[PDB]
Amino acid sequence: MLDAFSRVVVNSDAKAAYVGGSDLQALKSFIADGNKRLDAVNSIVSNASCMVSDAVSGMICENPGLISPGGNCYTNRRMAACLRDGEIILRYVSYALLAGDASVLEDRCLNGLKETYIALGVPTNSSIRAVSIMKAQAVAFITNTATERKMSFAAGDCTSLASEVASYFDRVGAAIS
C-alpha cells in the first residue's frame, strides 16, 4: 500500500517537490538500517505461537470475569475467535514494522474496527490489556531480555526499532479505544 519509500513522495507530490538530497539522508539511514530492521522482524515471527498463548492467558490471569459463563469470552468456539482476533493483530504490526510505516495497518485493520466490537459486545478494556502484553513481550523479543530464549545476533544498540514498535501498538490501542 504505502511505506517509508512512498511516505516521502506523497508530501512532495502534494507540493510538486522535485525530490533532491535534503530528505534523502533520512531514507539513507533507512537504507543503512535495512539489515537491522530485518533483524527485529525475524525474532517476532519466530515465536508468534508463544505470544498468542502468552497474552490471552495473561489476560485471563489478570481478569477471570470473561471465563465466567454469561460473560464475554468463556466457551469453546468463543475462545477460537479469541485466538483468531488476537493473531491477526500480530500479522498487521509485522507488516507495519517492515514498511517503516503503519499505513498498511491503518487501512486493512483500523477502519471502523472499534464499534464493530460493541456492535458485538467485546469489552474494549480487555483488548487494551491483551495488546499491552503483546507490546511488552515484543519489545523483549527484538532485544535479548527474554527469559530463556536467546537467539544469536550481532551486538549494538537497536532502541530505534523499539521506539518504532511502541509507536505502532498504541496506534492499535488508540484505534480500538
Binding site: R77, R108, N111, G112, L113, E115, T116, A119
Partner: protein, 238 residues
C-alpha cells in the same frame, strides 16, 4: 414550544439499522471477502478462476466496470433494494450448510455480510458460471438455455434493466466482451482435477438448496453438472 422535537417519518430505502451498524456492516463483509480471498489463496496463488480483465491491461477499465457495479447497486430503486435484503437472508441460510446460533445471527440483521457470503463462499467452490466446462454439444446447449431464463429474470419485460449494463463508455463496451472470452478459455486451461472437482461441486449448490423436491431437476444436475452450474439462482439481477 415542544422544542421542534417534532419528528415525522422518512423513507431511507435501505438497512437503516443504525449509522454505527451501517459502518460496521461493510467492515466484516470486507473481512468475509478477505476470509474468502484467503481460501481462494489458501495455497498462495491468485488462482486462475478469478480473472477481472482481458489480454490488454484494462482492469482499471474493469475498475470502472466494478465501480459501476459499486454504483448501480447503490442506485437501486426501493423495490429491488428491499427485495435483495430479504432474498439474500434466506440464501445465506442456503449458503451455510450447518445451522448455528452464530452465523445466521449475523446474516439476517446484516445483508452485505449475507451478500459477501453468497458471492464469497460460492466463488471458492467451482459451481459458478464460465468455470465448469461442458463435455459435449448436448451439455452446453442446455447450459445456454438455462442462461436465457437468467436473462429473462434480470430482463423481466420489454425494458432492459439498469443492472446488466456492464459498461458506461465506448472503451469498456467491447472490453466486456473480450474479458469473458479470455476467462472462458481459462476454465478449460487451468487444470485437470480441479475442473474434475467442479462437476462434483456443481451438484453441491443445485441439488441441496435450489431444486429440493424435484427429482427431474435433481438428475439434471447429476447428468449435466456444467449445465446446472450457470443456473445462477442467487438473484443478483445479472
Amino acid at each position: 414550544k415542544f422544542l421542534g422535537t417534532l419528528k415525522r417519518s422518512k423513507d431511507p430505502s435501505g438497512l437503516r439499522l443504525g449509522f454505527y451498524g451501517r459502518k460496521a456492516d461493510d467492515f466484516m463483509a470486507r473481512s468475509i471477502a478477505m476470509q474468502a480471498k484467503a481460501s481462494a489463496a489458501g495455497s498462495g496463488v491468485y488462482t486462475t478462476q478469478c480473472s477481472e480483465g482481458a489480454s490488454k491491461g484494462m482492469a482499471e477499465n474493469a475498475r470502472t466496470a466494478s465501480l459501476a457495479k459499486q454504483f448501480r447497486q447503490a442506485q437501486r430503486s426501493a423495490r429491488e433494494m428491499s427485495f435483495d435484503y430479504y432474498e439474500g437472508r434466506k440464501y445465506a441460510m442456503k449458503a451455510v450448510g450447518h445451522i448455528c446460533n452464530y452465523e445466521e445471527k449475523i446474516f439476517q440483521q446484516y445483508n452485505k455480510t449475507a451478500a459477501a457470503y453468497v458471492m464469497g463462499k460460492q466463488e471458492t467452490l467451482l459451481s459458478c458460471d464460465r468455470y465448469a466446462q461442458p463435455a459435449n454439444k448436448a451439455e452446453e446447449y442446455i447450459q445456454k438455455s438455462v442462461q436465457m431464463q437468467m436473462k429473462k429474470r434480470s430482463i423481466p419485460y420489454g425494458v432492459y434493466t439498469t443492472s446488466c449494463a456492464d459498461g458506461t463508455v465506448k472503451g469498456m463496451a467491447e472490453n466486456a466482451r473480450v474479458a469473458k472470452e479470455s476467462a472462458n478459455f481459462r476454465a478449460r486451461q487451468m487444470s485437470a482435477g480441479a475442473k474434475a472437482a467442479a462437476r462434483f461441486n456443481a451438484r453441491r449448490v443445485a441439488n441441496d438448496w435450489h431444486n429440493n423436491g424435484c427429482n427431474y431437476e435433481e438428475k439434471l444436475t447429476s447428468r449435466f453438472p456444467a449445465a446446472a452450474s450457470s443456473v445462477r439462482p442467487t438473484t443478483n439481477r445479472y
